[PDB]
From Swiss-Prot, chain A:
Required for initiation of chromosomal DNA replication. Binds to chromatin in a mutually dependent manner with the GINS DNA replication complex. Interacts with topbp1. Component of the CMG helicase complex, composed of the mcm2-7 complex, the GINS complex and cdc45. The keyword Chloroplast does not apply. This is Cell division control protein 45 homolog. Belongs to the CDC45 family. One of its GO terms (molecular function) is chromatin binding. Keywords: Cell cycle, Chromosome, DNA replication, Nucleus. One of its GO terms (biological process) is DNA replication initiation. PANTHER family: CDC45-RELATED PROTEIN, CELL DIVISION CONTROL PROTEIN 45 HOMOLOG. The lineage of its organism: Eukaryota, Metazoa, Chordata, Craniata, Vertebrata.
Swiss-Prot record, chain B:
It comes from Xenopus laevis. Signal peptide: none annotated. Component of the mcm2-7 complex (RLF-M). The complex forms a toroidal hexameric ring with the proposed subunit order mcm2-mcm6-mcm4-mcm7-mcm3-mcm5. Component of the replisome complex. Component of the CMG helicase complex, composed of the mcm2-7 complex, the GINS complex and cdc45. A zinc finger (C4-type) spans 149-175. It comes from the Eukaryota. Belongs to the MCM family. This is DNA replication licensing factor mcm2. The chain holds residues 166 to 432 of 886 of the full protein.
Length: 523, 267
């Protein structure tokens, strides 16, 4: 509810000792980078400590409850009553900048410690204070208000706005804001219209900073960051590996052409023949292809996609060129950072995984970025193979209104999906591919509930669920509430450590009763 | 001579139009257009070879089906040009993946043996069978050589080369420097070459007689389509080539014979 940021947020903590708590997500990392830049520019001491879940958040708050007074939380601790759990003092002030829209009502109506930085111009239906705090009507409002868990605006955009108000905004901060927005887009947490509006805003800012002029941008030396707007294709990492593998391992092209089936492969070959590109060049690395073939690639690809039932093959995004050879796109950075955050070979030193992910975002650690790109390629290949295996062998069963799929222990590359973000990406990709493949009209508008063997020793399986796919979805998810109610009804042993209530753990023994109770509840 | 008749410009144009119509309009037993699918499969896998069955060609054009076995060179050249035009119409961008579409003739009604080939079969499309015994490696051969002129630094036009003689240069526009003519390696066009050796089948050879053998020449897509010790059905142009060494050896003027392979099928 904080209305002003130049006077109520920054000036309060200029001459104090701040403690930053950042959740593990790319948008949070970008916001943290911008905040660190501002703090280092204004000579403000701070301590940055990684926070993963609710239990770790509480423990880390208990560790430093005396050494610090002012606390800043990014992309965490806004959908729950932080005051009750943490039990803070009067002196302590908590600044919260999180994207979760179902904000806790108690934190909303409080002026002691919870100064929410969340923008009040967003689509948020705040219930009446008197109705909640002053009785069945209160329960009705509670159920009508906390039904879904749709996300909100990007934290990096708020940080960039804060920097802009102070006139301390550079190209490096604008790039981090762009990366945060594109991270939100990639995870499919915001609607298309909101993405277009945010892209327009960031385009206005880019046009402001990159004030092109004759003989001013020509005498301007290379190695200065130059962000530009580009209406580019919908392929993943297509400038690093070959075009063929990029087409075969994306999500739009793989689902539209049904590449998991042989007829899909034949249609892909017909598509490539229609484009007019030799199979030799297409399978080579993008940086070694012929110049003539790369002249008007976008237009020809769009046309040949239009012929083959592919319409949304072009999206609006940004680029960056800081030197002779370096040139990236926002989605490439998102994939690299995401891969570095969630690694199984580097399961040791998870805090060091976070450290490497944070370091990769600076222009002086490009090697870590390249390793992240390679890891992202491997992850994309793994999820594509897993989706194909699940669809071909018919491991998805329409158990009532919601679909249920379970990954077997012997399934290859199953350790990769124990991580939350990888599991969510697999779930969305699998749902889209199955919707494209199946012919049942009713099944095309059903949700998916995927599982994975989180821990073999304790017999715990991780569970996730996503809203049913639609042409224009609201991205609203009710799976957390239903999961909680079904857990209470069955007296199950479930944990909600993750900041997203849609992801919970579950014992193997309690699986069947939990599933049946969920079927009954959703009926 | 059929060669003279098919060499006529009007006859050439008529044959070209008939072949184009045959390629564009040839329904199957169920009415499906066979050549559409054939060209789609050829361009889908980046090939430059289109097979044509002799039976349906005879069914739709008896005049051309009779002309072909007597003048197999010019008729096949016209077929290649028509096929290229049709493919370019169907796939406008195929000029990148290929530069010349070849036509392969299948199911030729006449079948002969290596022991019954005489001078009657010279310069005619024949179909034999046998077992391969030798296969040389793939070597590059001059297809279209671009001779230059030292007197003016201007380079003469392309000059086609055949497998029977050595091509000689033409005439420069005004500075007639016939002698000082050379070849550049960056504008000349080459093609693959492979000379297999086929012999009579072990079972079909007469007990009293001994196995015979004939040489065959493979070019362009045909190379590496056979391995020594394989039973094949070879269709090609029976060709006569002079060999003075055999003349001196036998003591009588004799000429060597080779087969310019056109279609090879492995059984
Ligand atoms: Zn000359």
């Amino acid at each position: 509810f904080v209305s002003d940021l130049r006077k109520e947020f920054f000036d309060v903590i200029v001459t104090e000792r701040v403690l930053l708590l950042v959740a593990p997500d790319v948008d949070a990392l970008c916001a943290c980078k911008i905040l660190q830049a501002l703090f280092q520019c204004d000579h403000v001491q701070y301590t940055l400590v990684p926070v993963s879940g609710w239990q770790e958040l509480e423990t880390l708050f208990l560790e430093h409850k005396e050494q610090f007074r002012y606390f800043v939380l990014i992309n965490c601790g806004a959908n729950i009553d932080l005051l009750e759990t943490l039990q803070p003092q009067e002196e302590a002030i908590f600044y919260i900048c999180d994207t979760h829209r179902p904000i806790d009502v108690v934190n909303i109506y409080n002026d002691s410690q919870v100064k929410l930085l969340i923008r009040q111009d967003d689509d948020l239906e705040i219930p009446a204070y008197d109705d909640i705090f002053n009785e069945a009507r209160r329960r009705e409002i509670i159920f009508d208000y906390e039904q879904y868990e749709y996300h909100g605006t990007s934290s990096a955009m708020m940080m960039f706005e804060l920097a802009w108000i102070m006139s301390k905004d550079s190209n490096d901060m604008l790039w981090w804001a762009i990366v945060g927005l594109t991270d939100q887009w990639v995870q499919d947490r915001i609607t298309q219209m909101k993405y277009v509006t945010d892209v327009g805003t960031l385009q206005r800012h880019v046009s402001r900073h990159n004030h092109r002029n004759e003989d001013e941008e020509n005498s301007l030396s290379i190695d200065c960051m130059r962000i530009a707007f580009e209406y580019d294709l919908r392929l993943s990492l297509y400038q690093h590996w070959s075009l063929y593998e990029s087409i075969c391992n994306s999500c739009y092209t793989s689902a539209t052409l049904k590449l998991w089936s042989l007829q899909g492969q034949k249609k892909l070959q017909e598509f490539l023949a229609d484009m007019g590109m030799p199979l030799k060049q297409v399978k080579q690395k993008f940086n070694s292809m012929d110049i003539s073939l790369k002249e008007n690639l976008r237009e020809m690809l769009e046309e040949s996609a239009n012929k083959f039932g592919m319409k949304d093959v072009r999206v609006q995004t940004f680029s960056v060129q800081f030197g002779f050879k370096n040139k990236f796109l926002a989605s490439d950075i998102v994939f690299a950072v995401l891969s570095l955050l969630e690694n199984t070979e580097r399961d040791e030193k998870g805090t060091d995984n976070f450290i490497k992910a944070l370091d990769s975002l600076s222009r002086s650690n490009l090697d870590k970025l390249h390793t992240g790109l390679e890891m992202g390629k491997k992850l994309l290949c793994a999820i594509q193979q897993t989706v194909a295996s699940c669809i071909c062998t018919n491991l998805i069963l329409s158990q009532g209104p919601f679909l249920y799929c379970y990954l077997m222990e012997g399934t290859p590359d199953v350790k990769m999906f124990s991580n939350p973000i990888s599991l969510c990406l697999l779930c969305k990709y699998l749902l889209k591919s199955f919707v494209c493949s199946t012919k049942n009209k009713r099944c095309k508008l059903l949700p998916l509930v995927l599982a994975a063997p989180l821990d073999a020793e304790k017999g715990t399986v991780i569970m996730v669920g996503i809203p049913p796919e639609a042409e224009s979805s609201d991205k609203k998810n009710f799976f957390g509430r239903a999961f909680e109610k079904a857990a209470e009804s069955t007296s199950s042993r479930t944990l909600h450590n993750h900041f997203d209530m849609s992801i919970i753990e579950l014992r193997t023994e309690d699986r069947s009763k939990f599933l049946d109770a969920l079927i009954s509840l959703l009926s | 001579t059929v060669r003279e008749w098919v060499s006529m410009a009007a006859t050439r144009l008529e044959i070209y139009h008939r072949f184009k119509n045959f390629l564009r309009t040839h329904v199957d037993e169920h009415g499906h257009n066979v050549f559409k699918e054939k060209i789609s499969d050829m361009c889908k896998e980046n090939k430059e070879s289109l097979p044509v069955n002799y039976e349906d060609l005879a069914a739709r054009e008896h005049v051309l089906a009779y002309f072909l076995p007597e003048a197999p060179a010019e008729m096949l050249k016209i077929f290649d040009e028509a096929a290229k035009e049709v493919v370019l119409v169907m796939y406008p961008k195929y000029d990148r993946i290929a530069r010349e579409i070849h036509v392969r003739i299948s199911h030729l009604p006449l079948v002969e043996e290596l022991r019954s080939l005489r001078q009657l079969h010279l310069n005619q499309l024949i179909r034999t069978s046998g077992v391969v015994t030798c296969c040389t490696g793939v070597l590059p051969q001059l297809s279209m050589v671009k001779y230059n002129c030292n007197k003016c630094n201007f380079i003469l036009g392309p000059f086609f080369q055949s497998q029977n003689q050595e091509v000689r240069p033409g005439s420069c526009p005004e500075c007639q420097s016939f002698g000082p003519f050379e070849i550049n390696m960056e504008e000349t066009v080459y093609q693959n070459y492979q000379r297999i050796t086929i012999q009579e089948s072990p079972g079909k050879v007469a007990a009293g007689r001994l196995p015979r053998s004939k040489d065959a020449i493979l070019l362009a897509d045909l190379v590496d389509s056979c391995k020594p010790g394989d039973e094949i059905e070879l269709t090609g142009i029976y060709h006569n080539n002079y060999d003075g060494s055999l003349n001196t050896a036998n003591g009588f003027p004799v000429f060597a014979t080779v087969i310019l392979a056109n279609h090879i099928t492995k059984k």
